[PDB]
RNA sequence: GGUCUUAAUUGGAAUGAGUACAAUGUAAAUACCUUAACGAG
């Protein structure tokens, strides 16, 4: 601990290790285990012991699957949802770039975006995409290519729509400085220059870009500040608690 | 918690019922009421405890109960109060009524069979018990000494909750209201402070700026306070205070000064200014009021902006000491309390149309 | 003046509390007398004011500085007693916790009679 | 491999180690104001001395200076909370000027007497070091203390000992309890 | 006789519970013996003292009052099915 | 020469250092804080 992401936000002082992230569908420093969702962020556990307590009684998926692994690496555009208490949080970024506590409607828990890893032909001549939280559909629209965004069902997996990489969509940033920034695009020289809805500029690799919808369009409701907070979104989360 | 209450243009103002009954005993010294029927507990100089019904307000108020003194307390937690009891108020559910005074004992009553429900001894040689106020819809209790302490009583565990410490000078006055919090003013200290119970903590209110600054402001073109008298406070986030030099000041925390003042209240009589003798306010609302020798009810409006105030009117009706002043509606109807003699016992002049008793007022709308 | 009445009444209030202090027309005259008095206060308002007027006479006699205050009630007040006081004697305490707003106060009287 | 504890010595002796004329000062300080030793008064030489120095800097500063003025203004105010300095001798040039006296005069120890409470320095220690004393409502039992401004009228006798109500003491009921087994019954 | 104030007071139905800080002022007792927190704490709700834990105590210094740490649950099953079991032998 | 001005005698009238029931503290203990019975010539 200490040589854990610094976005958990764990103190210093407490013992010697962090979670570490299981094996799962998002890389280690990208993700955001379960016990530091439940009791870190959320506050319903204290202890370890208790995270697992609670999450042996099933009271607990990630993405409508019961998930029951104390360090499971929830992430980006996850859902996490808790039944006995009726909540339905996504896992999106802050502007600082901190997983942010925000609940999502009773829908919308339905769906989530992914953006599209790799697209290629499988054996038996069948075509499959991957998204980035390793989400393998086969049969995709032939216009869905590497770097698009492509709305998954979830109860089903199902891509239901898709959107193109291109100039002037709306765009998440998942990664580096400007981690959290959301924004239109301008341009892809790879490096894609952004610019918010304040005519701010900015630049990253295309790898840390993300499609999440059209201008003024996003497919997703979008924590307080609209990338412009997960501070927020623990004020409201601990206060109606 | 704030003000909802925008009544101050309904006011029946100027016929005003107004009307007086002579009463028993002496020196009069306090004042309160129950609202859920209407009740009335007035405790005497006289070593009485008294207990009438206005709950009509077509009429006088009518005799209840009483229990009276002697000296046949003296001793060291008996029943009864030997000496004078210096201010009363009852249980906030109206089952029940407590007292204390120069004998710095707590005798807190069953009010409705009106006999000592219990006694709890205050311990100190000191502990003259100079004003009560419980906080609303509770049985906790605030209590003021000028051994500069404030004690609270949880009524139903008759136990002693808390304690508080640290006004330079003693402490006349408190207020309290639904939240948690209370506020003491600290007399020829020129300071008052706020007290939030849990949190344990005060802070700190300065008035007292000197004249040479009215002179100094005005002659681009008349009283030093000597004392903080009391103090009403009309929400959580902003109050009302009067000093013997007939300053009337607003204060809100916004500020560490004063957020609005006023000269001169009851008037004057080099010479001498009015002092401010009674103030209070009916809780959430833009009107308060204020009572003085001079006899004239002084009751003033909040205006919207809540950064000032102005005056309603006038209410002749009482004249000579003004101990106390309740508002209870049901409309509204005040109960003033009026003695010859001030609380305190430092004498002021020459009372007369002086009275003891209850002084009544009938206002609508 | 009312800057140096509040500073009185206060140095009084503390006076009386530290029982450093003398209250009525006869006890301060024999605090003068004994010279063990460090200044005396006077109300203004004092009636018949002659019953008073022996005091001026006899800290002018003795060197010990005297000022009227305006109110007999307020000085009452400030000798912590429910009654009107027309005179108040400060007592000597070379070792009194107030020594120094005693001595702050007769400068400022000193000054008025200079 | 842990995070030091800092501390710092807070007294400092003399040059000259016999001045007759030095030593008899002392003494009568140790005796107007109850003191024990002479660490007692070094303590406060030593407390002056960086008090004037830290004076001494922010006066060879502009006037006007935010150092001076944020800093002096601070050692000031500090200085008038506990009665130091005099309620106006509000100035640098004056804390200079400030001496021993001016802060020995407000030890609980001194304080205890100059409110009648003990009619004595000695009394004065003895009943601070054995509990008889609330400056508020906390027993406070050095006599070093330093009673600060508003904070001189909560100094009393405390809610425990015979001399602030309850019972009275162990010695005394020690006696209540000798009238009592032989000469009761 | 006690003055017994819980601050914080939060529902967690994930452990099937009331969350709460414990704030009991000792006037002049010497102490609590926890013991008789579960009995006051007890009966100030419906806890049949078996249904409540109170640990975290720490005296304030000078005296007089405790603060601490409360839980309250429904079901007294769940009380033996939730808690750390040195408090069950407690 | 100058200059100022007490006891190898007795009498009776609170407190923790310690010590120690308890409870408190602690993971268990210990000390601290609280506190019965004790504890000054």
Not at chain 1, 86 to 98: A, H
Not at chain 2, 122 to 146: H, P
Not at chain 2, 244 to 257: F, P, T, V
Not at chain 4, 22 to 49: H, M, P, T, V, W
Request: aromatic letters at 8%.
């Amino acid at each position: 601990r200490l040589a854990a992401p610094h976005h958990w936000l764990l103190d210093k002082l407490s013992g010697c290790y962090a979670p570490r992230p299981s094996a799962g569908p998002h890389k280690l420093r990208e993700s955001l285990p379960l016990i530091v969702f439940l009791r870190n962020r959320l506050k319903y556990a204290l202890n370890g012991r208790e995270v697992k307590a609670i999450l042996m009684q099933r009271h607990v998926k990630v993405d409508g699957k019961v998930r029951t692994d104390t360090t499971y690496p929830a992430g980006f555009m996850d859902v996490i949802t808790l039944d006995a208490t009726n909540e339905n949080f996504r896992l999106v970024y802050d502007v600082k770039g901190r997983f942010a506590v925000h609940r999502i409607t009773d829908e919308e828990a339905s769906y989530k975006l992914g953006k599209v890893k790799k697209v290629q032909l499988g054996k038996k001549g069948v075509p499959y995409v991957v998204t980035h939280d390793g989400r393998t559909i086969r049969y995709p629209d032939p216009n869905i290519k590497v770097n698009d965004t492509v709305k998954i069902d979830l109860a089903s997996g199902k891509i239901t729509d898709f959107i193109k990489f291109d100039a002037g969509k709306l765009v998440y940033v998942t990664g580096g400085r400007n981690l959290g920034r959301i924004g239109t695009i301008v341009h892809k020289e790879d490096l894609v220059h952004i610019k918010d809805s304040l005519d701010n500029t900015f630049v990253t690799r295309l790898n840390n870009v993300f499609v999440i919808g059209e201008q003024g369009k996003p497919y997703i409701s979008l924590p307080k500040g609209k990338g412009i907070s997960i501070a927020e979104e623990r004020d409201r989360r601990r206060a109606q608690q | 918690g704030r003000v909802f209450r925008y009544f101050g243009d309904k006011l029946l103002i100027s016929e005003a019922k107004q009307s007086f009954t002579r009463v028993g005993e002496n020196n009069l010294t306090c004042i309160s009421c129950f609202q859920p029927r209407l009740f009335a507990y007035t405790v005497s100089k006289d070593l009485q405890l008294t207990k009438y019904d206005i709950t009509d307000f077509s009429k006088r108020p009518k005799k209840l109960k009483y229990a009276k003194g002697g000296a046949k307390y003296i001793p060291n937690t008996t029943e009864g109060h030997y000496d004078e009891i210096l201010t009363v108020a009852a249980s906030p559910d109206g089952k029940y009524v407590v007292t204390g005074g120069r004998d710095r004992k707590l005798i807190v009553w069953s009010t409705e069979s009106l006999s000592p429900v219990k006694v709890i001894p205050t311990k100190d040689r000191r502990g003259e018990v100079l004003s009560l106020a419980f906080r609303k819809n509770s049985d906790q209790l605030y209590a003021s000494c000028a051994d500069f302490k404030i004690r609270t009583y949880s009524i139903n565990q008759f136990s002693q909750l808390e304690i508080l410490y640290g006004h330079h000078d003693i402490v006349e006055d408190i207020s309290a209201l639904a939240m948690e919090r209370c506020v003491t003013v600290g007399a020829r200290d020129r300071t008052a402070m706020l007290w939030k119970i849990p949190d344990e903590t005060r802070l700190t209110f300065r008035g007292g700026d000197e004249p040479q600054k009215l002179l100094r402001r005005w002659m681009k073109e008349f009283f030093c306070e000597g004392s903080i008298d009391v103090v009403s406070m009309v929400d959580d986030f902003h109050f009302i205070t009067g000093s013997d030099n007939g300053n009337i000041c607003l204060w809100s925390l916004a500020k560490k000064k004063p957020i609005f003042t006023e000269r001169i209240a009851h008037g004057i009589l080099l010479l001498q200014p009015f002092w401010i003798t009674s103030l209070y306010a009916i809780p959430y609302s833009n009107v308060f009021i204020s009572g003085s020798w001079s006899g004239s009810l002084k009751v003033w409006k909040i205006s919207d902006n809540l950064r000032s105030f102005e005056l309603l009117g006038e209410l002749s009706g009482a004249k000579g000491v003004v101990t106390k002043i309740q508002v209870v509606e049901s409309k509204f109807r005040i109960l003033a309390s009026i003695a010859k003699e001030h609380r305190l016992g430092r004498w002021i002049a020459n009372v007369s149309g002086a009275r003891n008793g209850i002084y009544s007022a009938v206002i609508d709308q | 003046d009312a800057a140096l009445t509040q500073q009185i009444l206060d140095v009084v209030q503390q006076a009386a509390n530290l029982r450093q202090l003398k209250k009525g027309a006869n006890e301060a005259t024999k605090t003068l007398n004994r010279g063990i008095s460090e200044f005396i206060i006077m109300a203004a308002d004092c009636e018949p004011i002659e019953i008073l007027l022996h005091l001026p006479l006899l800290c002018e006699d003795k060197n010990v500085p005297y000022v009227f205050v305006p109110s007999r009630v307020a000085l009452g007040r400030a000798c912590g007693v429910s009654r009107p006081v027309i005179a108040a004697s400060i007592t000597t305490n070379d070792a009194s916790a107030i020594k120094t707003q005693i001595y702050a106060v007769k400068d400022k009287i000193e000054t008025l009679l200079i | 491999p842990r995070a030091p504890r800092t501390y710092s010595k807070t007294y400092s002796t003399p040059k000259r180690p016999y001045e007759s004329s030095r030593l008899d000062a002392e003494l009568k300080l140790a005796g107007e104001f109850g003191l024990k030793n002479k660490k007692e008064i070094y303590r406060i030489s030593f407390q002056l001395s960086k008090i004037r120095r830290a004076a001494r800097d922010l006066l060879t500063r502009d006037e006007k200076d935010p150092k001076r003025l944020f800093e002096g203004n601070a050692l000031i105010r500090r200085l008038v909370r506990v009665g130091v300095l005099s309620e106006d001798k509000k100035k640098l040039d004056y804390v200079l000027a400030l001496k021993v006296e001016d802060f020995l005069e407000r030890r609980l120890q001194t304080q205890v007497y100059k409110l009648g409470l003990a009619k004595s320095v000695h009394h004065a220690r003895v009943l601070i070091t054995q509990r008889h004393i609330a400056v508020g409502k906390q027993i406070v039992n050095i006599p070093s203390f330093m009673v600060r401004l508003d904070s001189e009228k909560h100094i009393d006798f405390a809610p425990t000992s015979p001399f602030g109500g309850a019972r009275p003491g162990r010695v005394a009921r020690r006696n209540a309890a000798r009238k009592a087994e032989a000469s009761g019954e | 006789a006690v003055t017994i104030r819980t601050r914080k007071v939060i529902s967690n139905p994930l452990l099937a519970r009331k969350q709460f800080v414990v704030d009991v002022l000792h006037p002049n007792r010497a102490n609590v013996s926890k013991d008789e927190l579960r009995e006051k704490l007890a009966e100030v709700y419906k806890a049949e003292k078996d249904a409540v834990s109170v640990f975290g105590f720490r005296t304030q210094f000078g005296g007089g009052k405790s603060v601490g740490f409360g839980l309250v649950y429904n079901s007294v099953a769940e009380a033996k099915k939730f808690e750390p079991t040195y408090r069950l032998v407690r």
